[PDB]
Amino acid sequence: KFNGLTVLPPLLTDEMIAQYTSALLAGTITSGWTFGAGPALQIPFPMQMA
Amino acid sequence: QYGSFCTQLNRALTGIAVEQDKNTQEVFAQVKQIYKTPPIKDFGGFNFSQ
Amino acid sequence: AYSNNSIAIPTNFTISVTTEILPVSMTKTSVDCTMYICGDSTECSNLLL
Ligand SMILES: *[C@@H]1O[C@H](CO)[C@@H](O[C@@H]2O[C@H](CO)[C@@H](O)[C@H](O)[C@H]2NC(C)=O)[C@H](O)[C@H]1NC(C)=O
Ligand SMILES: *[C@@H]1O[C@H](CO)[C@@H](O)[C@H](O)[C@H]1NC(C)=O
Ligand SMILES: *[C@@H]1O[C@H](CO)[C@@H](O)[C@H](O)[C@H]1NC(C)=O
Numbered sequence: 078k079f080n081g082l083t084v085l086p087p088l089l090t091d092e093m094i095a096q097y098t099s100a101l102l103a104g105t106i107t108s109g110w111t112f113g114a115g116p117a118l119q120i121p122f123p124m125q126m127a
Numbered sequence: 128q129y130g131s132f133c134t135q136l137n138r139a140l141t142g143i144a145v146e147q148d149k150n151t152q153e154v155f156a157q158v159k160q161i162y163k164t165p166p167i168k169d170f171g172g173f174n175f176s177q
Numbered sequence: 178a179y180s181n182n183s184i185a186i187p188t189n190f191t192i193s194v195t196t197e198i199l200p201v202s203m204t205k206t207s208v209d210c211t212m213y214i215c216g217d218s219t220e221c222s223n224l225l226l
Binding site (some may be wrong): 085087088089094096097098100101102103104106107108112113117121122123 | 156
Binding site (some may be wrong): 122 | 184185
């Protein structure tokens with residue numbers, strides 16, 4: 078921290094960006110793309126690969 | 128008396144600072160809700176624990 | 178939850194239209210040193226050249 082110089086933290090804390098990452102990982106395995114294009118759905122993963 | 132050379136740097140510099148918040152907001156914020164993985168994690172063989 | 182023999186097929190559809198805004202051009206401008214830095218000044222014009 079020198080003179081006249083300062084640094085501000087990111088908008089989303091790493092403890093929080095992990096929240097978005099957790100939701101996207103949790104939504105992709107339990108609802109494929111259905112949550113992106115409308116409400117999430119219960120399509121089980123083993124058949125979602127099919 | 129040197130003019131507005133001082134402010135232009137400050138206002139322009141802040142633009143990048145606000146820009147970073149807009150960059151992260153449009154990357155991770157892709158879902159309007161929050162999703163949690165089911166307690167039991169039987170995915171027909173696949174291990175997501177990593 | 179999950180199930181090996183489960184499925185999900187939509188039985189209805191909804192047509193949606195979304196607006197995407199993209200700028201294609203910006204106000205074109207031209208500037209002149211001979212009039213900007215020096216204003217109708219012979220000595221200033223000579224120094225500039
Ligand atoms: C995690 O993924 C790996 C994928 O093979 C598996 O974990 C292995 O489980 C066996 C059985 O005890 C161990 O010998 C291995 O050391 C584990 N890891 C690896 C890399 O082989 C399993 O399918 C998944 N579940 C768990 C709980 O590990
Ligand atoms: C899916 O898992 C169930 C366990 O409840 C099992 O009975 C079934 O045979 C599995 N499906 C396939 C195709 O193996
Ligand atoms: C699909 O949804 C629309 C929404 O108004 C409804 O009018 C229509 O009857 C629905 N179709 C079927 C087959 O239920």
